[PDB]
Amino acid sequence: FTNVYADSFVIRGDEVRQIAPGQTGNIADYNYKLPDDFTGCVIAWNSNKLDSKVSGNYNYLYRLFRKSNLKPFERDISTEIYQAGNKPCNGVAGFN
Amino acid sequence: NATRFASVYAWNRKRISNCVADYSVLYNLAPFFTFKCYGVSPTKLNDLC
Q: CA–CA separation, A18 vs A43, rounded Å?
């Protein structure tokens, strides 16, 4: 092959079933998509005896919400608050 | 919206079947305290049968 692109990310064991080409989910839509012409392999390893924490690990965060479907192989760095209604959010959570 | 209620052990079960339930006025308002669940988003329930 020509080149390899390694994507390092941590996904909990309930949400690992959406990693396959042509899925639908929380991570499989607004975060990480696999197209039908995607070619490669998936390597996973159990980090629960090392990277876990008793009070919970807040060092990594994940995106549930997005306005539309995200294009694959693209990172979302945007800190913009999702606005459901016509009320302005002003950077913080609130009504709509 | 019911005035009365039940206790923890004695709870009644109201079966919802063969009807159309509108949850879209609840999610655009939200008097509800905290929504927490796993694997199914409660905001995605509007287009689901």
A: 14
* Resolution value in angstroms: 3.5
Query: Within 13 A of B29's CA, how many CA atoms are on the CB side?
Result: 7
Q: Do B41 and A64 touch (CB under 8 A)?
A: yes
Cβ-based contacts of A84 with chain B (< 8 Å): 28
> 3-state SS string over chain A?
CCCCCCCCCCCCCCHHHHCCCCCCCCHHHHCCCCCCCCCCCCCCCCCCCCCCCCCCCCCCCCCCCCCCCCCCCCCCCCCCCCCCCCCCCCCCCCCC
Question: Quick one: tokens of A22?
Answer: 């042509």
Would you state the structure tokens that stand for residue B6, as one six-digit string?
């039940």
- Rounded to whole angstroms, the Cα distance separating A4 from B30 reads 46
Exposed e or buried b for every residue in B7-45, given b needs 16+ CB within 10 A?
eeeeeeeeeeeeeeeeeeeeeeeeeeeeeeeeeeeeeee
The CA distance from A31 to the nearest CA of chain B, in Å, is: 15
Q: What is the dihedral of CA B24, B26, B32, B37, to 10 degrees?
A: -20
